Design a protein around this ligand. Sequence first.
Ligand SMILES: C[As](C)(=O)[O-]
Length: 451
Amino acid sequence: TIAIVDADATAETRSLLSYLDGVRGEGILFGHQHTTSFGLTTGPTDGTTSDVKNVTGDFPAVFGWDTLIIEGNERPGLAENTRDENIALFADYIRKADAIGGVNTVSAHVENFVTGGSFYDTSGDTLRAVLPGGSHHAELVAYLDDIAELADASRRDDGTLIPIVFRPWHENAGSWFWWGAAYGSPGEYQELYRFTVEYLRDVKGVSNFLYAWGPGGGFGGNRDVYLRTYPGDAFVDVLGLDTYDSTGSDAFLAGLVADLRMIAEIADEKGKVSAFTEFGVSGGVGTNGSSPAQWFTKVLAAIKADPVASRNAYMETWANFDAGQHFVPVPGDALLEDFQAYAADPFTLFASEVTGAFDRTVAAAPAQPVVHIASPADGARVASAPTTVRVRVGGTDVQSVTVEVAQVVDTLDLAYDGALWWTAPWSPYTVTATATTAAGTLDVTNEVAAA
Ligand SMILES: C[As](C)(=O)[O-]
């Protein structure tokens, strides 16, 4: 039996999670973003050819994708298409990847709902606007519905749902994305991530998703900084780390190993899976990138030389968009030889070396009882205006929920909305919710700031 975020996930999904954890320390799966949709040696793509396959002889073990496909911003998604047809093309590539024998993972560089800009547009205060009760919350819900559609469309010909590692709101420790650290307190981020899990799982019924959380990189092995944004054991299956470098220096490598063993330890302690969710040469390996000498093998060596840092299930590098920006070396790139050596190394696993990932029979541990206040989120700023307090109680039968605004200037009696939260209108420092449930009396406290 294993601790899995979706206690009622399909058998294949539970199996993948089991497989990923057992692979740790034994071998690491190599992954590549848009491996069959973007390539410099493949010619027009159709989801069946890859630069990785062409330069190493085998497809990557992990096929990474992104909701930008749905938006029609990245192939096979097309600008002219409706999100529904893009979704159809998206599922087709996942099915094909599954057929080839790889594991699928989906990240989400979500469009800025407020400005109409990209994921890089950090103006608009979009993170708070997208939180439950926010002005553009309905926009996020609709976006998540399309993802739920994608999850449902990802099925083998026999109808079996294809498992997918979903990794939303990544690299939030930095501020280059609108869901970054400068646009929302750690608490606001946690509610965004938590809502995303609950909405897809508890409201849409998605059951072939494994949830990954990777706040970024360069934590120097500091558990406290790494977990400051942590969504919680009940919301994460895979603990990630995103790190790029163009120096190849011993300092970089030392820092990397520190970070990699940190997540492996946290993972083992919690009985979860850890993985090098994103890695690569900064700026890529092409024209606008760099060619650190033997970067791939040096990084691999450092990883497998450490018994703890090697306990990570997979490592995915980025897409091969064009000559100026690509992460997997192709003929003409100085790092090609080194990358091929990295691929030939016994410790790195590719598609053909991944078998029986979805054939294991593991039981899902019962869902753990949790209670959290979706609004106002911890760390949020509350204006004098009228708001709604919403509390989420999952993994157990709830009879009642109460909230006390201390500083006890108020006491509210909530009512279930009949899908997700227990709410009550509130007209404005400490907000504590107490829910009388079958698992007993559960409470949680959020500290908010007044405007
Ligand atoms: C390649 As990225 C924007 O996920 O760091």
